[PDB]
Amino acid sequence: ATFLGLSSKQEKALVRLDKYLNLGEIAVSLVTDSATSIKVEGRQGYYQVSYKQPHQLYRALALLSAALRSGQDEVQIEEEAAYEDLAYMADCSRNAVLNLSSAKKMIEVLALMGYSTFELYMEDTYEIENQPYFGYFRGRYTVAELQEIEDYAADFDMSFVPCIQTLAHLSAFVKWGIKEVQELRDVEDILLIGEEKVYDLIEGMFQTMAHLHTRKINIGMDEAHLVGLGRYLIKHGFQNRSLLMCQHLERVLDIADKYGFNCQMWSDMFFKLMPEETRVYLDRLKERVTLVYWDYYQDSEEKYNRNFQNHHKISQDIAFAGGAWKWIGFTPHNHFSRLVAIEANKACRKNQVKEVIVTGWGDNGGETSQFSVLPALQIWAELAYRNDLKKVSEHFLVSTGLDFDDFMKIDLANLLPDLPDNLSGINPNRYVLYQDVLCPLLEQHIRPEKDKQHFASSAQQLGEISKRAGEYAYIFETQAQLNALLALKISITSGIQKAYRNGDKEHLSALAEKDFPQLYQMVEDFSDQFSRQWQQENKIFGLDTIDIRFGGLLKRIKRAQERLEQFISGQIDCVEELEQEILPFNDFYKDQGLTATTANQWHLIATASTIYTT
Amino acid sequence: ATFLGLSSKQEKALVRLDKYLNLGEIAVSLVTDSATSIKVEGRQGYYQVSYKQPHQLYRALALLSAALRSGQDEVQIEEEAAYEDLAYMADCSRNAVLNLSSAKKMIEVLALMGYSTFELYMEDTYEIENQPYFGYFRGRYTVAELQEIEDYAADFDMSFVPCIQTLAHLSAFVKWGIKEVQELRDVEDILLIGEEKVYDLIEGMFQTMAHLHTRKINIGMDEAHLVGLGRYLIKHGFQNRSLLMCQHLERVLDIADKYGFNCQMWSDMFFKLMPEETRVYLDRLKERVTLVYWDYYQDSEEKYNRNFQNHHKISQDIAFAGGAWKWIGFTPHNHFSRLVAIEANKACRKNQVKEVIVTGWGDNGGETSQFSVLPALQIWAELAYRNDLKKVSEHFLVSTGLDFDDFMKIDLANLLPDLPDNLSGINPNRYVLYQDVLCPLLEQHIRPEKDKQHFASSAQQLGEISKRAGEYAYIFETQAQLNALLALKISITSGIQKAYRNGDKEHLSALAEKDFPQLYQMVEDFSDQFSRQWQQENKIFGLDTIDIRFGGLLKRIKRAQERLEQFISGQIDCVEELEQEILPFNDFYKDQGLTATTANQWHLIATASTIYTT
Structure with missing residues (x-):
């Protein structure tokens, strides 16, 4: 195919995607238009493709490729996406660290599907200056590796969001029997709130990520039962977990602010909003984050709707995280993924959700293929762009x-x-x-x-x-x-x-x-x-x-x-x-x-x- | 050898010990005498053996066997034991459950060394009626097995003390994802204080042990950090760990009392004695138990002395538990065991200790031979009976x-x-x-x-x-x-x-x-x-x-x-x-x-x- 209207960046992307697209000897012209997400129109070898967001060019060209393979000469396609942002998060913390070649392949596939954003979940699997045990023998990404991945996504006008942990779920790190790690611990997998060496570590996390272009980050901050109940309790006595979570979150947000980051986090900590001065604390902190309602399991729209209603009592900035089931051993569950996606998509649309994150966790050893859930990923993209399969x-x-x-x-x-x-x-x-x-x-x-x-x-x-x-x-x-x-x-x-x-x-x-x-x-x-x-x-x-x-x-x-x-x-x-x-x-x-x-x-x-x- | 003064029970024991003793064609007469623990006196093929406690007959005969092998005709030996009770506790909870043949061999060896008591440490490795998951696939002892072991020790006039857990360190049991086990849990390896189904379980423990003759039992009851901080906290809110330990211990002692048991336990819970109504609680409960000061590590008498002094501020009923080092992999440390025994023996004598328990733990898989620490066991027996090696x-x-x-x-x-x-x-x-x-x-x-x-x-x-x-x-x-x-x-x-x-x-x-x-x-x-x-x-x-x-x-x-x-x-x-x-x-x-x-x-x-x- 030949093209009118391409930037040099789009030219390079189409060279990379050539093996996927089967456009043959046609002529395509491009237009940017905010009226609808994607439009593909034409006949007899001449087609016009319009897109609202630059990355949507690549889904539009996949739609054209498919329409022409199906034998169409005349093409008339229009899509209005439900979600401004559609993300896939791969797990790189459960022993399987996606290699760079595979990250590049996944980005290409996600581009063609219509995803705006690629995310990697990294508890301890990135390098931090002056923390040699953090990610030790884990295959941690270097700064240059994360930049290479981010830059490859940007080549398709896709965003990158690191998903890290700032309080709990750092089990592979906190195991090291060295003073400079043990002093950071509360109990089990949880870092010690109120410890200045812990805020030194967290500042290190942000210093690493500040080498990236992105200024969007998922900080985790779910609410583990034992927060405050280990070394914290021994040092300070018993404190309300919600007050500790507030104190810690404020420290983390002040660090993020210093480096120019806007933070997303799981909504759990704020369920209470849905002692006098602690309610006030939660109410002020909620204004500073995007809350993510996660649900991988529910089989009916109405169950999701109830939860969205409750979330919207406290904030309009509520993202949704669904599940591409690849964390149950060696074999995924794309079928179950489809069942829940159909229902979750209904609820996200009803509740005017702007961002959907599809999660690809790898619980207990990362035994399932990183490419096992391509069907679930396509399902979510189809639901997002067409509202059907x-x-x-x-x-x-x-x-x-x-x-x-x-x-x-x-x-x-x-x-x-x-x-x-x-x-x-x-x-x-x-x-x-x-x-x-x-x-x-x-x-x-x-x-x-x-x-x-x-x-x-x-x-x-x-x-x-x-x-x-x-x-x-x-x-x-x-x-x-x-x-x-x-x-x-x-x-x-x-x-x-x-x-x-x-x-x-x-x-x-x-x-x-x-x-x-x-x-x-x-x-x-x-x-x-x-x-x-x-x-x-x-x-x-x-x-x-x-x-x-x-x-x-x-x-x-x-x-x-x-x-x-x-x-x-x-x-x-x-x-x-x-x-x-x-x-x-x-x-x-x-x-x-x-x-x-x-x-x-x-x-x-x-x-x-x-x-x-x- | 031929004997005058034997009971039929002693006759049978000497048949079992014949292969160890090398008495040859001598004549031995027995006397019971409380003036000293052991006396062996004689010459020219005729010897008199006296003992204070019946089991001490077997050490006395080992002493004679040794004196005759060393070429003595004339024998004049007298020993005054420092400890009324000298015990060895084998670990049967770390995956290695001593088989019955090996338990019998160990009892024979302990008899010859001078031990009064054999003990087995069993977290979940005994059967309880109506608790099918307790010891499931662990090689739990049946009642008949425990009776057989107890009866074999009694054949040498040795006592038997089961060492169990009534609060924590039940990790192999609490792992089962069945309601009737999960409902018993606080957090990690700890049972739920205040739960009536937990007192049903503990009554089951005593019902099993009540099939034995012994009415002495070690109930454990060390003070784990997370006691009260899991499901307990969710059900009840935060409570002082010492108050919970008191409430639980009283329940356990009331059960033990019902079955006629006298309980030993680790002293840790009572360190505070060494809120007004909680101090009173500890002070009343201490009267009902024997406290065991455990120490496997200290290299100087004075370190032990300080701890004995502190213990004796609250009770005169203080036993000592030392260590036969066999819990550090595949290879024991009898050398280190000897170093600490020499010092601990000095301190136990100085502080008028009546009971010493030598522990043979098997931490993290039971990889060391059950017979690996015979040298350490002999060392402690020599120190107890002679005060030298x-x-x-x-x-x-x-x-x-x-x-x-x-x-x-x-x-x-x-x-x-x-x-x-x-x-x-x-x-x-x-x-x-x-x-x-x-x-x-x-x-x-x-x-x-x-x-x-x-x-x-x-x-x-x-x-x-x-x-x-x-x-x-x-x-x-x-x-x-x-x-x-x-x-x-x-x-x-x-x-x-x-x-x-x-x-x-x-x-x-x-x-x-x-x-x-x-x-x-x-x-x-x-x-x-x-x-x-x-x-x-x-x-x-x-x-x-x-x-x-x-x-x-x-x-x-x-x-x-x-x-x-x-x-x-x-x-x-x-x-x-x-x-x-x-x-x-x-x-x-x-x-x-x-x-x-x-x-x-x-x-x-x-x-x-x-x-x-x-």
Whole structure:
């Protein structure tokens, strides 16, 4: 294609996006117009594209690319976006630090989808001058790395917002047994309010971020239960948590003001607005921040509406944070993400929300692909720009080169048949993998025939998708292997429970001789595939935790084989592990009558023994 | 030997102890006499043994056995014990649950040494009716198991004291995400004071123990910082921790009273005695318990004396708990144990202490042999009965069949040359083993030539001891393997740091091709040996955590080899792990100027990444 009206900046962006767009030999003219977000109009090889915000050029060109692929000559498209700002926040704090190549790829995709803003969540994973332990061995970003990411987003007229922590959720930092870190602590993952060395640290955070162009930052500042109750209590006695939060927030805002930053934060601290001089304190501080209402779970518009109404009692500056579900193990939940997005979008529109942030957390090790939730991201963009999903497949094909319904199957290891679609966090991908074989703590939450058949079918389906997934094949290969592994692991685990119960030493010998070596090899092969996926997407730091978890699983599989062999041979009279009555693992979904559950802490899945505690 | 004056009970005990005692063809007559603890007198094949307490018969016979082996015909021995009760407490809560065969062996040894009492520390590792999650998959003792252990001790006229927890340190139990467990929690490892379901649980504890003959129990009741500050605070608001401790202790004592128990507990809660109506509360509760002053660390009598003086301001019923150091990894510290015992014994005698408890904790996984501290146990017995160590070797030979100085070398993996002897917890046995190879977090605390040479020498020494250690050979074989492993691991880890620094790809290739496979095999072999040791001593439950830790280490060793291979081949341009500046791990011994340190949490040694946190 050729263009009239481009800046040199837009020219360079279109060179970068050439591989996504399939415009062919057409002529496009550009206009800037505030009347509607995007307009694309033309026929017979000549089209005019208009955009309100500069970044919207790239979604407009994706819309044109799609309309022409669908066989249109005549094009007449107009979109009015619901949200002035639409952001994606990737988690870089849960061991997976997005590498620069992958950050650049994500920015390109987000540009084509229509996002205005890219965000990275970094607890301790950026460098601070004079804090050598902050981000130590974590793959922390350097200033130059953050600048490179910010500048790449700016190349597409997209903004950048760092999401940091100024009070709590600094667990990887506060673990270091050095005076200059320990003196900063209250208790658990929480920094010490009122400590001047803590305000020195926080000033360091802002000094790092001041090297960027952006002057918008998310400071966190959610309200942890133990704030004020550790070393704070020992130094000062008991204080109202809300008063401490106020004192701390004022200090943080005074620092942000010094460096020219405007702060966003979670709204939780202000729920009380929705002692005399403390209410006054909250009321003054609320004027200085943008509040973000976060909700990843609710299945009905009206539930969101009630919360928006309550927030608007105290401020009109309320942003919304929704969820692209990628924090429940190795496998995302784009399906659940879609369900909640549909409802949240209704509520955000009704309550005149101007900014939506889609969050991509990575809870407990960052085991899910950084690109696992592209479908959810497209869904939110379609909802924002069109208020429907009628063109989600056509637009997704531009964004990714793949079929949307194929990509949605990435979820399969979580999609057990007949689960209610509105229940979140159900993650057998993860807990079926990591549970022990001899002492399977999740065994009563598994349907050993039904679930096994689901995983086996899923592996076959994903094997076929991977062959047509191009540069994303690697993520589907990981999922195909996982599903195959889960099916065999269930067969063996449940098979041992039954053969042992019935004293069937012959079936146990078959398992020991044939199935165990197969399982062991499949786990080794899975670790190798996962390692390829990790290294494509993330810095090397953090893969070590997954090495530990997989290494341990492998050794436990070897133990199970050896213990069974000794029982079969007569070297031992019984396998005491297999004599124990198994109980439910948790009751999270007992009230809903489910067999599956949510279990999202590796150390609790893998063993009942102590492993972190003293 | 033949005997006049034995009961049928003593006859049966002497049959059990026959293999330890080497009395030959002599004649022994017994007398009970309160004038002195033990007297052994005779000549020319005819001896009279007198004892004050029945269990002291067995030490008296060990003294005779030793005197006759030393070549004496004429024997004239008299001992006046300093302590009416001398106890050993084994830890059964840190994943290692002593098996019944090993409990019986330990009781026999303790009988010969002169201990009056055997104790087991069980947080959650006993069965409670109607609490199926309490001790679930932990190897909890059944009532019949505890009875069998108690009855075996009674067979030697020894007492049994269960050591339980009635408030805090129930971390393995409170982890279960089931309403009927979660409703019992305050925060972290602490039960909820004032909750009637918690008093139902505690009554269950006593109902279990009431099946025993003993009516002496250690209830724990140390004073954790967060008592009252979790769900308690949410339900009730902020309360003085001392008042809550009083309220809870009264409830626990009322339950104990119902079942006929007399309670011992740590003295900490009462330090304040050493608001008006709260002081009164403490003063009334102190009359109902025996207080135990615990101290495992102090290197001078006068330090203990000061604490005894302070305790005696509030009660004359003060017991002392000393330490047999076996909670710092895979290797004990009998040497340090001896240093502190000498001083503590002086202070206990000066302050007229009647009961000494020697504790054998197993912090963070129970990795040290249950029989690792026999030397420390003999030391305390000699100090108690003779006030010196002049006969420690002679008496130890009866107790164990081995040389005391040989057995003391079990400590070698902690005995780095030139460490100050009065500094506790220095545990390179553990942190040199578990640190990573690519990201060695403890590297600055290692002297790479000096320490390597120490470990290599130690492996040789222990290899020779193991050949003459009889039925204890297995514990020395574990130590010989560990020391050899540590030496090679240092060579490789430090060798990589230097070869990479200097760009020496050839030396890295040698390491990758030869040394890495050797190390990997040595770790596999060590895990196999450790597993043999574990299964000799403990129930199977809990070995799983060590499988996880070793499995992870193995996988990290494989990663290190693979990453180096890719660097050598040119598949990658650098190994980012090896480009990071290493920092001190901790500053625990910075003020003493040490290079080595204490590091006793596996999850912090093995990785800087998150592994337990969300």
